Design a protein around this ligand. Structure first.
Ligand code: A1AM5
Ligand code: ZN
Length: 140
């Protein structure tokens, strides 16, 4: 589990969004596994605006942060998981590491702040939903 908290925004995996996230929806995209909902309190987090290919993610299934290299966000075939069928996901970054379904929502960070959230796993990769393209997360 987990989310990004930037301004009056809460960024979560679409597949883990609550009734309340949907009830206060801002934006959502199933191709990205992303949902954004409005928040009453303001958030501690800063979004990266950059093309860094190195950073650190939280792995909740190892209670550990791991430094990774990762591909630029792209349109990737992900095999079938407990929360999705085998499908094309867009704006996805892949690194070599550990990701179980429960690890979705853990942060990936670089020197510029939050890059994305764990969204895929299996066959020794960890996939992350890029949010660096979402410039509207920074104001309003
Ligand atoms: C509920 N969201 C559905 C969805 C939105 C956008 C796309 C894409 F951009 F890829 F065309 C695919 C699926
Ligand atoms: Zn960066």
């Amino acid at each position: 589990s987990g989310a990004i908290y930037v301004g009056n925004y809460r960024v979560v995996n679409r597949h883990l969004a609550t009734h309340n996230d949907w009830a206060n929806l801002v934006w959502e995209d199933s191709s990205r596994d992303l949902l954004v909902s409005s928040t009453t309190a303001q958030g501690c987090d800063t979004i990266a605006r950059c093309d860094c290919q190195t950073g650190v993610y939280y792995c909740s299934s190892r209670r550990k942060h791991y430094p990774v290299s990762f591909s630029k966000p792209s349109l990737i075939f992900v095999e079938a998981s407990e929360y999705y069928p085998a499908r094309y996901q867009s704006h996805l970054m892949l690194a070599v590491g550990h990701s179980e379904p429960g690890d979705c929502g853990g942060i990936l960070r670089c020197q510029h702040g939050v890059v994305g959230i764990v969204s895929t796993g299996g066959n020794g990769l960890v996939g992350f939903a890029d949010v660096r393209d979402l410039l509207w997360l920074d104001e309003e």
